[PDB]
């Protein structure tokens, strides 16, 4: 059937050409349909993990930036609870508006979100557009999870994304107790009197 | 020499040249006092890097 317990939606946001989709498609198992990016805009792949004996579906929505979808993508951040700003260390002008994406995503996403920040394409280690310690600091006074996100031969994502679903899980994993259902008696022949 | 309170005195120091086939002046440029650091892109043209190396 379906049988999962919670379902989160997590946007991937950034400038165009920073390498979000190739980061996605290694990492999620698949989405069963290649489909296309730019017909409705934003595409989406699923990922199922389990936390704390609860089973979680997480739906990653990565967003394109072709300047046509102006009102459309801002409608797509409505209700968005998990977030990931991706930037590349090779090029440098994406970091000038990573803060622009951050203040657009603090706007109209939820009451509270948990935004990660990820540096794609660490494979070309000899081309650092921005120092990692500055982005690490900018994550530190913005309450953001920071990962190297090196491209190829990496798991940085397979521990950081699980940690993102943990932090967003106890943001909404409120409370429950038990569903045991073992209390049985009263098998008589009913000498009733009304 | 003697310089009193404002009087400049241009010292004329004679030296020789240097030989371009004796020193290489295209070696690792502007060496850092301490090794390591961020290792950010230079952000300058290779030709500019040549004249900055010579002028240092």
Curated annotation (Swiss-Prot), chain A:
The keyword Protein transport applies. GO terms for molecular function: GTP binding; GTPase activity. It comes from the Eukaryota. Alternates between an inactive form bound to GDP and an active form bound to GTP. Activated by the guanine nucleotide-exchange factor (GEF) TRAPP complex, and inactivated by GTPase-activating protein (GAP) GYP3. Disulfide bonds: none annotated. A motif (Effector region) lies at residues 36-44. It is found in: Golgi apparatus membrane. Its main location: Golgi. Changing residue 66 to L: Reduces GTPase activity. Keywords: Acetylation, Autophagy, Exocytosis, Golgi apparatus, GTP-binding, Lipoprotein, Membrane, Nucleotide-binding, Prenylation, Protein transport, Transport. The keyword Kinase does not apply. Residues 180-191 have a biased composition (Low complexity). Interacts with YIF1, YIP3, YIP4 and YIP5. Interacts with the GEF SEC2. Interacts with TRS130. Belongs to the small GTPase superfamily. Rab family. Present with 4298 molecules/cell in log phase SD medium. This is GTP-binding protein YPT32/YPT11. It comes from Saccharomyces cerevisiae (strain ATCC 204508 / S288c).
From Swiss-Prot, chain B:
It is found in: Golgi apparatus, cis-Golgi network. Specific subunit of the TRAPP II complex, a highly conserved vesicle tethering complex that functions in the late Golgi as a guanine nucleotide exchanger (GEF) for the Golgi YPT1 GTPase. TRS120 plays a role in the YPT GEF activity of TRAPP II in concert with the two other TRAPP II-specific subunits TRS65 and TRS130. Belongs to the TRS120 family. Present with 259 molecules/cell in log phase SD medium. Part of the multisubunit TRAPP (transport protein particle) II complex composed of BET3, BET5, TRS20, TRS23, TRS31, TRS33, TRS65, TRS120 and TRS130. Interacts directly with TRS65. This is Trafficking protein particle complex II-specific subunit 120. It comes from Saccharomyces cerevisiae (strain ATCC 204508 / S288c) (Baker's yeast). The chain holds residues 1066 to 1121 of 1289 of the full protein.
